[PDB]
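Quick one:
INPUT:
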């Protein structure tokens, strides 16, 4: 039942909604969710493509914007920024109640900037200022350029959702860049206590890539094993003396956020990823149907740190089979960027 969301909060995990639309906010539904245990919202270009195509409340907005001399991208941005600002307003009470630790809404920069660090910084600063809310996060893909941008944006005091992570190594690079940005701010006497960063580590895509060619005992296990190992890496990085010296001065840890947690293979239970990845100081962003399924028949138990030994043994067998999870991660990130650009082009076409 619904109380499962508060049970998961007590285990230290926030559950965010992986969807946003004009009607979600305008109907009052989002406000009701933020009382029922939902703690934040994520978007991406595919979410906007589907919302713009299917939500009747965009029609009048598009018609109005087609009366102005605007590029398709600025029409999209005007719409998306308005939706994000409205959602931030709905989530503000939650955000303020926790000292700014919850209640975030994420907006992703243009996919075409993913390999351009300077361009990404420029767009992220601009979108942060355009939204003009303390609980907005700018979503930036974790390419090498995105990790460069992350350091700069953190040093600017901007909260960031670093996305399309599939690699433990790249995630650790992201933590190091975060810490460099934090250390810069502390050295300059600037505040850090309101800077929040999440590392959105993708789940279902790993299993979708591998399962058809894996042995029995490994089908449907790799993505969870990879996440469990990532969380162990997280514990080690953020408890180390280097980060502790920053946390003593007010720095917040990065938190892992499990994304792509809707189950895509009907051979697995629909709550598999949510049920299996619950642990302290994490986030899980779920599509509506997965949130529904978890409320109906999910289980709230601290599963993320269970059986870490088996996770390690499974990743060792993956390697034994010749699957290089770092090569896979790079491909999946590339593929995700291509897919987000495809969705973005699809949504811009009706805005011409």
């Amino acid at each position: 039942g619904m109380t499962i969301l508060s049970d998961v909060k007590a285990l230290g995990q926030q559950i965010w909604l992986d969807n946003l639309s004009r009607s979600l906010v305008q109907s009052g539904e989002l406000a009701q969710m933020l009382k029922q245990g939902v703690c934040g919202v994520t978007s991406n270009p595919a979410i906007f493509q589907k919302a713009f195509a299917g939500d009747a409340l965009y029609a009048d907005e598009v018609a109005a914007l087609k009366r102005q001399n605007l590029s398709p991208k600025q029409r999209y941005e005007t719409m998306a920024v308005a939706d994000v600002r409205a959602a931030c307003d709905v989530c503000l009470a939650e955000h303020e109640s926790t000292g700014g630790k919850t209640g975030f809404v994420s907006l992703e920069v243009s996919p075409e900037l993913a390999k351009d660090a300077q361009g990404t910084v420029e767009e992220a600063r601009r979108l942060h200022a355009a939204i003009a809310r303390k609980n907005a996060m700018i979503k930036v893909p974790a390419t090498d350029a995105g990790i460069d941008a992350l350091e700069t944006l953190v040093s600017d005091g901007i909260s960031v959702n670093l996305t399309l992570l599939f690699s433990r190594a790249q995630t650790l690079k992201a933590y190091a860049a975060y810490a460099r940005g934090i250390a810069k701010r502390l050295a300059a006497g600037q505040s850090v206590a309101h800077i929040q960063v999440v590392a959105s580590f993708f789940i279902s895509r790993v299993d979708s890539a591998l399962d058809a060619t894996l042995p029995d005992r490994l089908k449907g296990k790799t993505a969870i094993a990879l996440a469990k190992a990532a969380y162990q890496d997280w514990e080690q990085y953020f408890t180390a003396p280097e980060f502790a010296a920053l946390e003593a001065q007010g720095a917040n840890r990065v938190q892992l956020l499990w994304a792509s947690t809707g189950v895509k293979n009907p051979a697995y239970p629909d709550t598999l990823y949510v049920d299996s990845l619950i642990g302290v100081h994490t986030v899980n962003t779920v599509p509506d149907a997965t949130l529904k399924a978890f409320i109906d028949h999910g289980t709230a138990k601290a599963t993320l740190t269970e059986s870490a030994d088996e996770a390690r043994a499974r990743l060792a067998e993956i390697a034994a089979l010749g699957i290089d999870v770092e090569t896979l991660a790079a491909r999946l990130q590339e593929d995700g960027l291509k897919q987000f650009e495809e969705a973005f082009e699809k949504l811009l076409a009706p805005l011409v």
